[PDB]
Amino acid sequence: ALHFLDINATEVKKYPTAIQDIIINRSFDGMIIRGVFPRDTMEQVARCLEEGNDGGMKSILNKNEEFGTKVAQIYGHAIVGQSPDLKDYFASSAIFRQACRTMFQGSPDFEEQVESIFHSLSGLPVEIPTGPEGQTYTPATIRLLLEGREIAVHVGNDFLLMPAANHLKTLLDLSDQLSYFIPLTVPEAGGELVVYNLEWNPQEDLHKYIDEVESKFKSNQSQSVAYAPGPGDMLLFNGGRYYHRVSEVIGNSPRRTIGGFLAFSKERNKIYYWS
């Protein structure tokens, strides 16, 4: 039942209602957009991180050691699992934007490239949502997935019913939250995005959430598709509706991705993207 599209970033303007078709029409569920960022740009950013000349990106690195092998280490705080006050979230968001802008060196700039992609797929203006006191949300976060580590099965729409999304929920339309990511570094094997035909149910603590989803996902039978995008390719899929995960990274070479989420504004006149 799951349908994805394999298109190049040079033909995004040929699909002007893509985001509309996934969220509202539900005619197709995912999109793999090849060559959004060049391979050299992805190599240079990855090299900036591992060497430490990252514009202070390492200062907002969350090892997530309190969890198991079923989560990624993350550069900046992701909205998921944050406390409802968002004080730490908003401070890391500002550090992220600056450090990310520095690493990309406008070759192309991460924020404007991605925004021009979401705008090409909608025809609507693309913005990073603002907090209650005018603070910026982070446009994305960098997920570092080491050997033996994976991103455990979850569904995206569950996140907008959590206390951290209390303010953001009021800015968005009552519809499916899309999920996006672009690999910086890809592993030798593993680190695949496995998407299941299984759907989110409204009436059905991150440590508790991981254990709850896994126990319910255990019983249910579903169809699966696997995607391993290359460095610079965008994977824009209905992560809000469909249960998905990232398989165990095989080999010494780690998996590094820059991504987040996107959903329509209350009046469907704007696109909001964050992490």
Ligand X SMILES: O=C(O)CCC(=O)C(=O)O
Position 229 contacts ligand X (CB under 6 A): no
In angstroms, the Cα distances linking 141 to 23, 30, 40, 72, 261 are 23, 21, 20, 11, 10
Interface with ligand X by CB under 6 A: which range of 75-83, 85-93, 168-176, 238-246? 238-246
Closest Cα to residue 140, out of 269, 244, 34, 236? 236
Cα–Cα distance, 249 to 254 (Å, whole number): 7
Position 238 contacts Cl ion (CB under 5 A): no
Helices (H), 52-195: 87-104, 110-122
Q: Are 35 and 67 in contact (CB under 8 A)?
A: no
By beta carbon distance, the residue nearest Zn ion is 239
Position 81 contacts Zn ion (CB under 5 A): no
Q: Which member of 239, 254, 259, 260 binds Zn ion (CB under 5 A)?
A: 239
Closest Cα to residue 173, out of 239, 269, 86? 269
Cβ closer to ligand X: 90 or 180? Answer: 180
Cβ closer to Cl ion: 30 or 156? Answer: 156
Cβ closer to ligand X: 9 or 145? Answer: 145
Cβ closer to ligand X: 135 or 250? Answer: 250
Cα–Cα distance, 113 to 250 (Å, whole number): 30
Cα–Cα distance, 53 to 166 (Å, whole number): 35
- Tokens representing 21 are 């078709």
Q: Are 55 and 45 in contact (CB under 8 A)?
A: no
Mask of contacts with Zn ion, 175-204, x by CB under 5 A? Answer: ----x-------------------------
Binding site feature residues: 143, 154, 179, 244, 255, 257
Mask of contacts with ligand X, 164-193, x by CB under 6 A? Answer: ---------------x-x-----------x
Position 156 contacts Cl ion (CB under 5 A): yes
- Write the single-letter amino acid at 129: P
Closest separation between CB of residue 134 and ligand X, Å? 27
Cα–Cα distance, 174 to 264 (Å, whole number): 9
Site of interaction with ligand X (CB under 6 A): 143, 151, 156, 179, 181, 193, 239, 244, 246, 257, 259
Residue ranges in contact with Zn ion by CB under 5 A: 179, 239
- Residues contributing to the site for Cl ion (CB under 5 A): 156, 179, 239
